[PDB]
Amino acid sequence: MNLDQAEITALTKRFETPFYLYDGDFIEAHYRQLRSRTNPAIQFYLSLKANNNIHLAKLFRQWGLGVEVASAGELALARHAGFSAENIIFSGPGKKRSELEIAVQSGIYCIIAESVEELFYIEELAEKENKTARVAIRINPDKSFGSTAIKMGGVPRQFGMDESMLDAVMDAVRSLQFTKFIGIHVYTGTQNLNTDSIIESMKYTVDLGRNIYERYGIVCECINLGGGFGVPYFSHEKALDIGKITRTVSDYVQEARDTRFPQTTFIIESGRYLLAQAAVYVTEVLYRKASKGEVFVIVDGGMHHHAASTFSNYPMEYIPVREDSGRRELEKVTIAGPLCTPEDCLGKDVHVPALYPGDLVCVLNSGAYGLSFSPVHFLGHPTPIEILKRNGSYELIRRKGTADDIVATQLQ
Protein backbone atom coordinates (compact mmCIF):
# COMPACT_ATOMS: atom_id res chain seq x y z
CA MET A 1 0.00 0.00 0.00
CA ASN A 2 1.55 3.44 -0.49
CA LEU A 3 2.07 5.37 2.72
CA ASP A 4 1.28 9.09 2.52
CA GLN A 5 3.17 10.69 5.41
CA ALA A 6 1.10 13.89 5.36
CA GLU A 7 -2.07 11.78 5.37
CA ILE A 8 -0.87 9.78 8.37
CA THR A 9 0.23 12.89 10.28
CA ALA A 10 -3.18 14.45 9.60
CA LEU A 11 -4.93 11.30 10.85
CA THR A 12 -3.05 11.42 14.16
CA LYS A 13 -4.66 14.81 14.82
CA ARG A 14 -8.08 13.13 14.45
CA PHE A 15 -7.39 9.65 15.90
CA GLU A 16 -5.32 8.83 18.96
CA THR A 17 -2.28 6.64 18.38
CA PRO A 18 -1.57 3.83 18.36
CA PHE A 19 -3.90 2.80 15.54
CA TYR A 20 -4.18 0.42 12.59
CA LEU A 21 -4.87 2.06 9.23
CA TYR A 22 -6.15 -0.13 6.38
CA ASP A 23 -5.98 0.91 2.72
CA GLY A 24 -9.28 -0.49 1.44
CA ASP A 25 -8.53 0.65 -2.11
CA PHE A 26 -5.41 -1.49 -2.05
CA ILE A 27 -7.36 -4.38 -0.50
CA GLU A 28 -9.79 -4.36 -3.42
CA ALA A 29 -7.20 -3.86 -6.18
CA HIS A 30 -4.92 -6.53 -4.71
CA TYR A 31 -7.82 -9.01 -4.50
CA ARG A 32 -9.09 -8.24 -8.00
CA GLN A 33 -5.64 -8.78 -9.50
CA LEU A 34 -5.52 -12.21 -7.85
CA ARG A 35 -9.09 -13.01 -8.93
CA SER A 36 -8.50 -12.00 -12.54
CA ARG A 37 -5.61 -14.48 -12.86
CA THR A 38 -7.55 -17.44 -11.45
CA ASN A 39 -9.87 -19.97 -13.10
CA PRO A 40 -13.50 -19.00 -12.29
CA ALA A 41 -14.18 -22.53 -10.96
CA ILE A 42 -11.89 -21.65 -8.03
CA GLN A 43 -13.58 -19.57 -5.31
CA PHE A 44 -11.43 -17.69 -2.84
CA TYR A 45 -12.20 -18.06 0.87
CA LEU A 46 -11.10 -15.52 3.47
CA SER A 47 -9.52 -17.05 6.57
CA LEU A 48 -11.13 -15.05 9.35
CA LYS A 49 -8.45 -15.83 11.91
CA ALA A 50 -6.02 -13.53 10.08
CA ASN A 51 -8.15 -10.49 10.98
CA ASN A 52 -11.34 -10.54 13.05
CA ASN A 53 -12.65 -7.12 12.01
CA ILE A 54 -16.14 -7.65 10.57
CA HIS A 55 -15.98 -4.44 8.52
CA LEU A 56 -13.00 -5.72 6.56
CA ALA A 57 -14.59 -9.16 6.23
CA LYS A 58 -17.73 -7.52 4.81
CA LEU A 59 -15.67 -6.18 1.89
CA PHE A 60 -14.66 -9.69 0.89
CA ARG A 61 -18.23 -10.91 1.39
CA GLN A 62 -19.42 -8.24 -1.05
CA TRP A 63 -16.85 -9.36 -3.65
CA GLY A 64 -18.13 -12.96 -3.54
CA LEU A 65 -15.54 -14.71 -1.39
CA GLY A 66 -16.40 -17.43 1.06
CA VAL A 67 -15.19 -17.43 4.64
CA GLU A 68 -13.31 -20.09 6.61
CA VAL A 69 -14.10 -20.03 10.34
CA ALA A 70 -12.39 -21.98 13.09
CA SER A 71 -14.78 -21.59 16.03
CA ALA A 72 -18.37 -20.85 16.87
CA GLY A 73 -17.22 -17.32 17.71
CA GLU A 74 -15.79 -16.87 14.21
CA LEU A 75 -19.06 -18.30 12.84
CA ALA A 76 -20.87 -15.48 14.65
CA LEU A 77 -18.43 -12.92 13.22
CA ALA A 78 -18.99 -14.36 9.74
CA ARG A 79 -22.73 -13.82 10.09
CA HIS A 80 -22.21 -10.26 11.39
CA ALA A 81 -20.20 -9.73 8.19
CA GLY A 82 -23.14 -11.01 6.11
CA PHE A 83 -21.65 -14.18 4.66
CA SER A 84 -24.38 -16.57 3.61
CA ALA A 85 -24.45 -20.11 5.00
CA GLU A 86 -23.58 -21.55 1.56
CA ASN A 87 -20.31 -19.55 1.70
CA ILE A 88 -19.14 -20.63 5.18
CA ILE A 89 -16.84 -23.55 5.98
CA PHE A 90 -15.76 -24.65 9.47
CA SER A 91 -12.25 -25.96 10.12
CA GLY A 92 -10.27 -26.91 13.18
CA PRO A 93 -8.77 -29.86 15.07
CA GLY A 94 -10.59 -29.32 18.36
CA LYS A 95 -14.23 -28.52 17.72
CA LYS A 96 -16.35 -28.94 20.83
CA ARG A 97 -19.69 -30.70 20.47
CA SER A 98 -21.43 -27.38 21.26
CA GLU A 99 -19.62 -25.82 18.28
CA LEU A 100 -20.59 -28.73 16.04
CA GLU A 101 -24.18 -28.29 17.24
CA ILE A 102 -24.33 -24.62 16.20
CA ALA A 103 -22.68 -25.46 12.87
CA VAL A 104 -25.27 -28.18 12.15
CA GLN A 105 -28.08 -25.82 13.22
CA SER A 106 -26.71 -23.10 10.90
CA GLY A 107 -26.78 -25.27 7.77
CA ILE A 108 -23.37 -24.07 6.59
CA TYR A 109 -21.75 -25.31 3.38
CA CYS A 110 -19.60 -27.80 5.25
CA ILE A 111 -17.91 -28.76 8.47
CA ILE A 112 -14.37 -29.91 7.69
CA ALA A 113 -13.91 -32.88 10.00
CA GLU A 114 -10.49 -33.73 11.43
CA SER A 115 -11.26 -37.10 13.04
CA VAL A 116 -13.56 -40.08 12.70
CA GLU A 117 -14.94 -39.34 16.18
CA GLU A 118 -15.88 -35.86 14.93
CA LEU A 119 -17.79 -37.44 12.04
CA PHE A 120 -19.84 -39.51 14.47
CA TYR A 121 -20.57 -36.44 16.64
CA ILE A 122 -21.82 -34.61 13.55
CA GLU A 123 -24.04 -37.54 12.61
CA GLU A 124 -25.55 -37.65 16.09
CA LEU A 125 -26.28 -33.92 15.97
CA ALA A 126 -27.74 -34.11 12.46
CA GLU A 127 -30.13 -36.78 13.71
CA LYS A 128 -31.14 -34.69 16.72
CA GLU A 129 -31.66 -31.59 14.57
CA ASN A 130 -33.42 -33.42 11.71
CA LYS A 131 -30.91 -32.06 9.20
CA THR A 132 -28.54 -33.43 6.59
CA ALA A 133 -25.11 -32.27 7.67
CA ARG A 134 -22.51 -31.64 4.96
CA VAL A 135 -18.96 -32.71 5.80
CA ALA A 136 -15.52 -32.62 4.22
CA ILE A 137 -12.39 -34.33 5.47
CA ARG A 138 -9.09 -32.63 6.23
CA ILE A 139 -6.30 -34.87 4.91
CA ASN A 140 -2.70 -34.78 6.11
CA PRO A 141 -0.91 -35.92 2.92
CA ASP A 142 1.55 -38.79 3.00
CA LYS A 143 4.01 -36.66 1.05
CA SER A 144 6.38 -33.80 1.88
CA PHE A 145 6.35 -30.80 -0.42
CA GLY A 146 9.20 -28.63 -1.67
CA SER A 147 12.82 -29.55 -2.27
CA THR A 148 14.18 -29.27 1.29
CA ALA A 149 12.60 -31.93 3.57
CA ILE A 150 14.64 -35.05 4.29
CA LYS A 151 12.19 -37.88 4.88
CA MET A 152 9.58 -38.92 2.34
CA GLY A 153 5.99 -39.45 3.32
CA GLY A 154 4.75 -36.25 4.92
CA VAL A 155 4.94 -34.95 8.46
CA PRO A 156 3.27 -35.72 11.82
CA ARG A 157 0.59 -33.13 12.51
CA GLN A 158 -2.29 -32.60 14.93
CA PHE A 159 -4.44 -31.49 11.97
CA GLY A 160 -6.74 -33.73 9.96
CA MET A 161 -6.29 -37.41 9.25
CA ASP A 162 -3.29 -39.12 7.64
CA GLU A 163 -3.87 -39.99 3.99
CA SER A 164 -2.99 -43.61 4.87
CA MET A 165 -6.20 -43.71 6.96
CA LEU A 166 -8.46 -42.86 4.01
CA ASP A 167 -10.09 -46.31 3.83
CA ALA A 168 -11.10 -46.21 7.50
CA VAL A 169 -12.34 -42.63 7.12
CA MET A 170 -14.40 -43.43 4.00
CA ASP A 171 -15.84 -46.54 5.68
CA ALA A 172 -17.00 -44.31 8.55
CA VAL A 173 -18.26 -41.60 6.15
CA ARG A 174 -20.37 -43.99 4.12
CA SER A 175 -22.08 -45.38 7.25
CA LEU A 176 -23.48 -41.97 8.30
CA GLN A 177 -27.11 -41.80 7.23
CA PHE A 178 -27.74 -38.11 8.05
CA THR A 179 -24.42 -36.76 6.80
CA LYS A 180 -23.43 -36.04 3.19
CA PHE A 181 -19.76 -36.26 2.21
CA ILE A 182 -18.88 -33.33 -0.02
CA GLY A 183 -15.12 -33.47 -0.37
CA ILE A 184 -11.62 -32.91 0.93
CA HIS A 185 -9.26 -30.24 2.25
CA VAL A 186 -5.45 -30.01 2.34
CA TYR A 187 -3.64 -27.11 4.02
CA THR A 188 0.12 -27.29 4.27
CA GLY A 189 0.80 -24.34 6.60
CA THR A 190 1.07 -20.58 6.80
CA GLN A 191 3.73 -18.19 5.44
CA ASN A 192 4.71 -20.42 2.54
CA LEU A 193 7.13 -18.51 0.32
CA ASN A 194 8.08 -21.51 -1.84
CA THR A 195 6.15 -21.12 -5.10
CA ASP A 196 6.80 -24.63 -6.36
CA SER A 197 5.79 -26.26 -3.06
CA ILE A 198 2.42 -24.52 -3.22
CA ILE A 199 1.83 -25.65 -6.81
CA GLU A 200 2.87 -29.20 -5.89
CA SER A 201 0.53 -29.40 -2.90
CA MET A 202 -2.47 -28.02 -4.80
CA LYS A 203 -1.89 -30.44 -7.69
CA TYR A 204 -1.56 -33.26 -5.14
CA THR A 205 -4.93 -32.27 -3.67
CA VAL A 206 -6.66 -32.40 -7.06
CA ASP A 207 -5.03 -35.79 -7.59
CA LEU A 208 -6.37 -36.96 -4.22
CA GLY A 209 -9.81 -36.09 -5.54
CA ARG A 210 -9.14 -38.33 -8.52
CA ASN A 211 -7.90 -41.07 -6.16
CA ILE A 212 -11.16 -40.88 -4.20
CA TYR A 213 -13.17 -41.37 -7.39
CA GLU A 214 -10.96 -44.30 -8.45
CA ARG A 215 -11.14 -46.03 -5.05
CA TYR A 216 -14.69 -45.22 -3.88
CA GLY A 217 -16.63 -44.05 -6.92
CA ILE A 218 -17.33 -40.70 -5.23
CA VAL A 219 -16.91 -37.38 -7.06
CA CYS A 220 -15.97 -34.70 -4.54
CA GLU A 221 -18.31 -31.72 -4.82
CA CYS A 222 -15.74 -29.51 -3.07
CA ILE A 223 -11.96 -29.72 -3.27
CA ASN A 224 -10.31 -27.23 -0.90
CA LEU A 225 -6.72 -26.60 -2.04
CA GLY A 226 -5.77 -24.61 1.06
CA GLY A 227 -3.08 -22.07 0.31
CA GLY A 228 -0.93 -20.51 2.99
CA PHE A 229 0.42 -17.96 0.50
CA GLY A 230 3.20 -16.11 2.27
CA VAL A 231 4.05 -12.42 2.24
CA PRO A 232 7.67 -11.16 2.51
CA TYR A 233 8.33 -9.31 5.76
CA PHE A 234 12.13 -9.23 5.82
CA SER A 235 14.73 -8.03 3.34
CA HIS A 236 16.00 -11.55 2.62
CA GLU A 237 12.51 -12.81 1.72
CA LYS A 238 11.22 -12.90 -1.86
CA ALA A 239 7.60 -12.59 -2.94
CA LEU A 240 5.77 -15.58 -4.36
CA ASP A 241 5.41 -15.91 -8.12
CA ILE A 242 1.63 -15.52 -7.90
CA GLY A 243 1.41 -15.53 -11.70
CA LYS A 244 2.98 -18.98 -11.84
CA ILE A 245 0.79 -20.38 -9.04
CA THR A 246 -2.45 -19.03 -10.48
CA ARG A 247 -1.71 -20.09 -14.06
CA THR A 248 -0.47 -23.60 -13.25
CA VAL A 249 -3.18 -24.45 -10.71
CA SER A 250 -5.92 -22.92 -12.90
CA ASP A 251 -4.84 -25.14 -15.80
CA TYR A 252 -4.70 -28.24 -13.57
CA VAL A 253 -8.16 -27.46 -12.19
CA GLN A 254 -9.53 -26.86 -15.70
CA GLU A 255 -8.31 -30.30 -16.78
CA ALA A 256 -10.16 -31.79 -13.80
CA ARG A 257 -13.33 -29.82 -14.60
CA ASP A 258 -13.13 -30.95 -18.24
CA THR A 259 -12.98 -34.60 -17.21
CA ARG A 260 -14.13 -35.97 -13.86
CA PHE A 261 -15.16 -32.86 -11.87
CA PRO A 262 -17.47 -30.69 -14.04
CA GLN A 263 -19.54 -29.28 -11.14
CA THR A 264 -16.94 -29.30 -8.37
CA THR A 265 -16.23 -26.14 -6.37
CA PHE A 266 -12.49 -25.65 -5.91
CA ILE A 267 -11.38 -23.40 -3.03
CA ILE A 268 -8.20 -21.46 -2.35
CA GLU A 269 -8.08 -20.03 1.17
CA SER A 270 -6.17 -16.91 2.15
CA GLY A 271 -5.81 -14.71 5.20
CA ARG A 272 -2.31 -13.25 5.21
CA TYR A 273 -1.95 -12.70 1.46
CA LEU A 274 -5.26 -10.84 1.19
CA LEU A 275 -4.64 -8.53 4.17
CA ALA A 276 -1.03 -8.26 5.41
CA GLN A 277 0.23 -5.53 3.08
CA ALA A 278 -2.95 -3.46 3.35
CA ALA A 279 -2.36 -2.02 6.84
CA VAL A 280 0.08 0.09 8.78
CA TYR A 281 0.31 0.23 12.57
CA VAL A 282 1.03 3.85 13.52
CA THR A 283 2.64 4.64 16.89
CA GLU A 284 4.00 7.88 18.35
CA VAL A 285 7.39 8.27 20.04
CA LEU A 286 6.79 9.18 23.69
CA TYR A 287 10.34 9.26 25.11
CA ARG A 288 13.96 8.98 24.05
CA LYS A 289 16.84 8.02 26.32
CA ALA A 290 20.39 6.76 26.34
CA SER A 291 21.26 3.72 28.44
CA LYS A 292 24.82 2.44 28.76
CA GLY A 293 25.91 3.47 25.29
CA GLU A 294 22.66 2.56 23.52
CA VAL A 295 19.68 4.69 22.49
CA PHE A 296 16.13 3.61 23.30
CA VAL A 297 13.03 5.11 21.67
CA ILE A 298 9.80 4.36 23.57
CA VAL A 299 6.61 4.36 21.50
CA ASP A 300 2.94 4.33 22.55
CA GLY A 301 2.11 0.99 20.96
CA GLY A 302 3.62 -2.45 21.06
CA MET A 303 3.25 -6.11 21.85
CA HIS A 304 -0.25 -5.88 23.33
CA HIS A 305 -1.51 -4.64 19.93
CA HIS A 306 0.91 -6.13 17.45
CA ALA A 307 2.68 -9.09 19.01
CA ALA A 308 3.96 -10.49 15.72
CA SER A 309 6.28 -7.52 15.23
CA THR A 310 7.92 -8.35 18.54
CA PHE A 311 9.13 -11.89 18.27
CA SER A 312 14.55 -9.74 12.65
CA ASN A 313 12.43 -6.58 12.40
CA TYR A 314 9.25 -5.79 10.46
CA PRO A 315 9.53 -3.17 7.72
CA MET A 316 9.07 0.26 9.25
CA GLU A 317 8.75 3.84 8.05
CA TYR A 318 9.48 6.91 10.14
CA ILE A 319 7.68 10.26 10.03
CA PRO A 320 9.50 13.23 11.62
CA VAL A 321 6.99 15.51 13.34
CA ARG A 322 8.85 17.31 16.15
CA GLU A 323 9.51 20.87 15.01
CA ASP A 324 12.66 21.86 16.89
CA SER A 325 15.54 19.59 16.26
CA GLY A 326 16.89 18.91 12.73
CA ARG A 327 19.32 16.54 14.47
CA ARG A 328 18.24 13.67 12.20
CA GLU A 329 21.53 11.81 11.69
CA LEU A 330 21.33 8.06 11.12
CA GLU A 331 21.72 6.16 14.39
CA LYS A 332 21.36 2.66 15.72
CA VAL A 333 18.42 2.49 18.19
CA THR A 334 16.14 0.06 19.95
CA ILE A 335 12.44 0.84 19.56
CA ALA A 336 10.44 -0.36 22.57
CA GLY A 337 6.75 -0.13 23.46
CA PRO A 338 5.15 1.07 26.71
CA LEU A 339 4.89 -2.33 28.43
CA CYS A 340 6.81 -3.27 31.58
CA THR A 341 8.64 -6.16 29.91
CA PRO A 342 11.79 -6.35 27.75
CA GLU A 343 9.86 -8.48 25.23
CA ASP A 344 7.95 -5.33 24.12
CA CYS A 345 10.48 -4.49 21.41
CA LEU A 346 9.38 -3.40 17.94
CA GLY A 347 12.94 -3.11 16.65
CA LYS A 348 16.30 -4.01 18.15
CA ASP A 349 19.50 -2.34 16.92
CA VAL A 350 17.71 -0.80 13.98
CA HIS A 351 19.47 1.90 11.92
CA VAL A 352 17.08 4.85 11.56
CA PRO A 353 17.15 8.63 11.26
CA ALA A 354 17.19 9.96 14.82
CA LEU A 355 13.73 9.64 16.38
CA TYR A 356 12.43 12.23 18.86
CA PRO A 357 9.23 12.50 20.92
CA GLY A 358 6.31 13.27 18.63
CA ASP A 359 7.73 11.44 15.63
CA LEU A 360 5.66 8.57 14.24
CA VAL A 361 6.85 4.98 13.76
CA CYS A 362 4.81 3.12 11.15
CA VAL A 363 4.98 -0.67 11.12
CA LEU A 364 4.24 -2.00 7.64
CA ASN A 365 2.61 -5.28 6.61
CA SER A 366 0.41 -5.16 9.73
CA GLY A 367 -2.95 -6.21 8.24
CA ALA A 368 -2.88 -9.89 9.18
CA TYR A 369 -2.21 -11.60 12.51
CA GLY A 370 -2.30 -8.17 14.17
CA LEU A 371 -4.71 -7.05 16.90
CA SER A 372 -6.55 -10.33 17.44
CA PHE A 373 -3.22 -12.20 17.52
CA SER A 374 -2.00 -10.07 20.43
CA PRO A 375 -2.50 -10.14 24.23
CA VAL A 376 -4.79 -7.14 24.11
CA HIS A 377 -5.49 -6.92 27.85
CA PHE A 378 -1.92 -7.41 29.05
CA LEU A 379 -1.00 -4.45 31.31
CA GLY A 380 -4.46 -2.91 30.86
CA HIS A 381 -3.85 -0.55 27.94
CA PRO A 382 -6.82 0.39 25.71
CA THR A 383 -7.19 -1.68 22.57
CA PRO A 384 -6.37 0.46 19.51
CA ILE A 385 -8.50 2.33 17.05
CA GLU A 386 -8.76 0.82 13.57
CA ILE A 387 -9.42 3.04 10.55
CA LEU A 388 -10.47 2.03 7.03
CA LYS A 389 -9.51 4.32 4.13
CA ARG A 390 -11.62 3.72 1.06
CA ASN A 391 -13.06 5.68 -1.86
CA GLY A 392 -11.48 8.87 -0.52
CA SER A 393 -13.08 8.70 2.94
CA TYR A 394 -11.98 7.40 6.33
CA GLU A 395 -14.21 5.19 8.47
CA LEU A 396 -13.70 4.20 12.10
CA ILE A 397 -13.94 0.39 12.13
CA ARG A 398 -12.98 -0.22 15.76
CA ARG A 399 -13.34 2.17 18.69
CA LYS A 400 -10.63 2.66 21.29
CA GLY A 401 -10.88 0.19 24.15
CA THR A 402 -11.85 1.14 27.69
CA ALA A 403 -11.14 -0.20 31.16
CA ASP A 404 -14.77 -1.37 31.23
CA ASP A 405 -13.87 -3.72 28.36
CA ILE A 406 -11.24 -5.36 30.60
CA VAL A 407 -13.53 -5.96 33.61
CA ALA A 408 -16.69 -6.93 31.71
CA THR A 409 -16.17 -10.67 32.27
CA GLN A 410 -15.22 -10.06 35.93
CA LEU A 411 -18.14 -7.93 37.20
CA GLN A 412 -20.69 -10.10 35.58
Ligand X SMILES: *Cc1c(COP(=O)(O)O)cnc(C)c1O
Residues found near ligand X in the complex (CB under 6 A): 47, 49-50, 68, 91, 187, 190, 226-229, 269-273, 340
CB under 5 to 8 A by kind: which of its own copies, ligand X, none does 289 bind?
A: its own copies
Min dist. Cβ of residue 256 to ligand X (A):
21
Three-state secondary structure along the chain? CCCCHHHHHHHHHHCCCCEEEEEHHHHHHHHHHHHHCCCCCEEEEEEHHHCCCHHHHHHHHHHCCEEEECCHHHHHHHHHCCCCHHHEEECCCCCCHHHHHHHHHHCCCEEEECCHHHHHHHHHHHHHHCCCEEEEEEEECCCCCCCCCCCCCCCCCCCCEEHHHHHHHHHHHHCCCCEEEEEEECCCCCCECCHHHHHHHHHHHHHHHHHHHHHHCCCCCEEECCCCECCCCCCCCCCCCHHHHHHHHHHHHHHHHHCCCCCCEEEEEECHHHHHHHEEEEEEEEEEEEECCEEEEEECCCCCCCHHHHCCCCCEEEECCCCCCCCCCEEEEEEECCCCCCCCEEEEEEEEECCCCCCEEEECCCCCCCHHHCCCCHHHCCCCEEEEEECCEEEEEECCCCHHHHHHHHHC
Compare residues 12 and 310 and give the one whose CB is closer to ligand X.
310
71 among the known binding-site residues?
no
Min dist. Cβ of residue 41 to its own copies (A):
26
The window from 155-163, 174-182, 232-240, 251-259 that contacts its own copies (CB under 8 A) reads 155-163
410 binding its own copies? (CB under 8 A): yes
Compare residues 57 and 245 and give the one whose CB is closer to its own copies.
57
CB under 5 to 8 A by kind: which of its own copies, ligand X, none does 240 bind?
A: none
The window from 193-201, 231-239, 256-264, 295-303 that contacts its own copies (CB under 8 A) reads 295-303
- Helix axis angle, 24-36 relative to 54-63, nearest 10°? 30
40 binding its own copies? (CB under 8 A): no
Min dist. Cβ of residue 241 to its own copies (A):
25
Compare residues 110 and 354 and give the one whose CB is closer to ligand X.
110
Compare residues 9 and 191 and give the one whose CB is closer to ligand X.
191
327 among the known binding-site residues?
no
The window from 87-95, 257-265, 273-281, 319-327 that contacts its own copies (CB under 8 A) reads 87-95
324 binding its own copies? (CB under 8 A): no
Compare residues 57 and 319 and give the one whose CB is closer to ligand X.
57
Residue of 289, 325, 327, 395 that binds its own copies (CB under 8 A)? 289
Compare residues 12 and 53 and give the one whose CB is closer to ligand X.
53
301 among the known binding-site residues?
no
Min dist. Cβ of residue 165 to its own copies (A):
8
298 binding its own copies? (CB under 8 A): yes
153 among the known binding-site residues?
no
Residues in the annotated binding site: 228, 269-272, 369
Residues in the annotated binding site for substrate: 272, 369
